[PDB]
């Protein structure tokens, strides 16, 4: 179907086909050398250049080397720099360039390739959708929104644009408005719409507006493999890890960590209280749209397995104490942080992002009544000097209706069944 040969390339199709045959037989090295010969003999040939690139791409795949794939990315660009490139080949080449840039994590350069693609092919709606994703991946939600509004104005029924518009709206706290877009885009069945993110956020928005249908979408997402279960809706996970909402110290195997937190709880408290009194700006408001109302702030000592040195100046003995426990200080998918919540606070039901951590809560200042945390189908209360442990990849909710502040200490650990090599390689969250 695709027309990849311009006028001159049709006159050397025999050579081009011979080289491509080598590539599709898996004789990568031979194909590479054959296409390099064709590029030196026919330096303006788009199809020869594309063969060189595709061969480098296959080579990176076989060698699992990013270095080789960067070479291929430049060759994909070279293709588009030649004269008289057929439109189908131009698009294939720059699309694969963008996709491999994203694979490597080069989101800014992928964005650039996508802007070029949309300029070259102004009527291809799918390229505009891909450009929207490019904007999302660098955190530019404002431009992603404009892109999908353009798509929807020319193609109102595009399901991919619908779910992504809905996702942007919901992240902007436009909850009610987001629901029809997320729902209709998932129901569209269009490619790219069967995505856990959209089931997760459609169900959440429904829950927040009181729509009792949210768990139908949770059950559909579970049926389609995005969620380990209805209640545990994390999206970055290692399948097979024991899944339960509440853990005992012994169940975790981190008994020394728990003992250390409990036996020393007063110094942990007192350093947190000194930061409250004399360095309150180290506590930062929760910024993930998880509150229905109230005041909630966190003072973070570790995130993604990286110690915040400035932060630890304010809790130096606590940081020194925790250094002895790599199971938390090296948990690249958790945090260590103080958490203060004030009266009148309701945290929306929500899920954390990964089933790869468990979450310890050490009580520090706990009002006698008004404070409680539900996880899945179990509600519990804190106690000063005592650790609770739950899997925050399960849906959980918190209320603060006391008459004064509630201070806890949050220590995330690696899920205990994760192997050493898993703990070392899983990308940080």
């Amino acid at each position: 179907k695709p027309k990849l040969l311009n006028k001159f390339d049709k006159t050397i199709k025999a050579e081009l086909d011979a080289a491509e045959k080598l590539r599709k037989r898996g004789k990568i090295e031979e194909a590479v050398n054959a296409f390099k010969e064709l590029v030196r003999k026919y330096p303006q040939s788009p199809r020869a250049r594309y063969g060189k690139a595709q061969c480098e791409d296959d080579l990176a795949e076989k060698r699992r080397s990013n270095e080789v794939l960067r070479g291929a990315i430049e060759t994909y660009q070279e293709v588009a720099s030649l004269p008289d490139v057929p439109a189908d080949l131009l698009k294939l080449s720059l699309k694969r360039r963008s996709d491999r840039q994203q694979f490597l994590g080069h989101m800014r350069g992928s964005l650039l390739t996508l802007q070029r693609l949309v300029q070259l092919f102004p009527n291809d709606t799918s390229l505009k959708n891909d450009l929207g994703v490019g904007y999302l991946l660098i955190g530019d939600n404002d431009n992603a929104k404009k892109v999908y509004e353009e798509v929807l104005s020319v193609t109102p029924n595009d399901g991919f644009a619908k779910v992504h518009y809905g996702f942007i709206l919901k992240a902007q706290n436009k909850i009610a408005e987001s629901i029809p877009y997320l729902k209709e885009g998932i129901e569209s069945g269009d490619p790219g719409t069967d995505d856990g993110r959209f089931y997760f956020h459609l169900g959440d928005a429904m829950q927040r507006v009181g729509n009792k249908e949210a768990y139908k979408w949770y059950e559909l997402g579970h049926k389609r493999g995005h969620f380990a279960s209805v209640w545990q809706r994390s999206l970055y996970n290692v399948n097979g890890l024991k899944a339960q909402p509440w853990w005992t110290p012994k169940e975790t195997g981190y008994t020394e960590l728990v003992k250390s937190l409990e036996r020393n709880w007063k110094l942990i408290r007192d350093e947190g209280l000194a930061v409250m009194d004399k360095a309150k700006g180290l506590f930062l408001p929760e910024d993930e749209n998880l509150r229905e109302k109230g005041d909630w702030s966190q003072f973070t000592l570790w995130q993604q397995g990286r110690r915040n040195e400035n932060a630890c100046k304010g809790a130096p003995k606590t940081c020194t104490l925790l250094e002895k426990f790599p199971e938390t200080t090296g948990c690249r998918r958790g945090q260590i942080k103080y958490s203060i919540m004030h009266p009148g606070t309701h945290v929306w039901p929500h899920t954390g992002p990964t089933n790869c951590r468990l979450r310890m809560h050490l009580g520090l200042v706990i009002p006698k009544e008004g404070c409680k945390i539900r996880c899945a189908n179990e509600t519990k209360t804190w106690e000063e000097g005592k650790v609770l442990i739950f899997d925050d990849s399960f849906e959980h909710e918190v209320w603060q209706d006391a008459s004064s502040f509630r201070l806890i200490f949050i220590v995330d650990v690696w899920h205990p069944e994760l192997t050493p090599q898993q703990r070392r390689s899983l990308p940080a969250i």
Partner: peptide
């Protein structure tokens, strides 16, 4: 933006190839 307590970002990891 990072995914700390929730799943609000379009992606929560920053991948780096193979």
């Amino acid at each position: 933006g990072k995914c700390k307590d929730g799943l609000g970002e379009y992606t929560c990891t920053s991948l780096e190839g193979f």
